[PDB]
Design a protein around this ligand. Structure first.
Ligand code: AES
Length: 285
């Protein structure tokens, strides 16, 4: 459970970041084995089609070790299930976790001058969504307004911005999920996220769950990694995100994994190195 014991010198597990009693608002913190005065931080988020509220250990086991070996503190967070709270609960959870880490950095030997964020599938969606809403309190489409920043926890005065994003095959363009050209029907995970409505009938909801719509020239840099044989979230999603970053004047690096699946082929030394090199380069810029 979690990252290999020899990858970290210090661990805090099941730290609640929302000042409540919900496991969906817990996180785990790991500091690298290589001891140092303070550590730049990476927040990681599991994928689960937004359904899981307790899988932070899976994320740590999946991509925690390379980050620790690269010298970063790793914070793996839970978020609430789409089945217990609809959008924007999940991004409000992420924002609250970010505020908790930034505010409490000193207590955990964390250097708050760099906080990156990364996740796979729905965790990549949440990571990208944080990276397109630095400094953004609310978003509106038509008559619908969602509170992105939220009011969860006891660190509301702390900033919730992230400095860099790594998006592992995240669903980010739900207007173009079905056959890469249309919204999915009410049977699908994004339908649950928006309250079990039919995405094909809810253009405002679909816009407000899709971070591709809010990319701006001033966004933090992003690294996008997607397998060209992903049979769960289509490659077109990351192609589209890169095109939007390119056309918005923002900075995106897109790495396509040949033969890569929804994880398989992607979680290997080469692309872990791409992620840790990216975060390391960003940590200095
Ligand atoms: S990812 O594994 O978290 C993921 C998988 C499947 C979906 C459904 C999109 N129609 C979303 C995210």
């Amino acid at each position: 459970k979690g990252p290999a014991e020899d990858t970290y010198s210090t661990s805090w597990t099941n730290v609640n970041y929302a000042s409540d009693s919900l496991e969906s608002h817990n996180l785990d913190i790991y500091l690298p084995k290589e001891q140092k005065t303070a550590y730049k931080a990476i927040i990681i988020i599991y994928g689960s089609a937004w359904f899981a509220n307790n899988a932070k250990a899976m994320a740590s086991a999946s991509i925690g070790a390379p980050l620790l070996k690269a010298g970063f503190a790793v914070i793996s967070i839970n978020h609430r299930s789409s089945m217990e709270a609809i959008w924007p609960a999940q991004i409000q959870d992420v924002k609250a976790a970010i505020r908790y880490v930034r505010s409490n950095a000193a207590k955990y030997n964390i250097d708050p001058s760099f906080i990156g964020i990364t996740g796979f599938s729905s965790g990549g969606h949440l990571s990208a969504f944080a990276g397109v809403t630095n400094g953004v309190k609310t978003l509106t489409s038509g008559d619908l307004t969602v509170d992105i920043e939220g009011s969860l926890g006891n660190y509301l005065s702390t900033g919730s911005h992230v400095d860099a994003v790594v998006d592992w095959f995240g669903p980010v363009d739900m207007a173009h999920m079905s056959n890469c050209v249309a919204p999915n029907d009410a049977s699908t995970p994004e339908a649950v996220l928006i309250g079990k409505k039919d995405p094909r009938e809810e253009p405002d909801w679909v816009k407000l769950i899709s971070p591709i719509n809010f990319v701006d020239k001033d966004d933090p840099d992003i690294l996008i990694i997607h397998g060209d044989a992903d049979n769960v979230v289509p490659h077109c999603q990351s192609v589209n995100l890169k095109n939007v970053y390119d056309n918005a004047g923002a900075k995106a690096t897109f790495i396509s994994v040949p033969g890569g699946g929804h994880g398989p082929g992607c979680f290997d030394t080469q692309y872990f190195k791409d992620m840790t090199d990216f975060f390391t380069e960003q940590s200095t810029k």
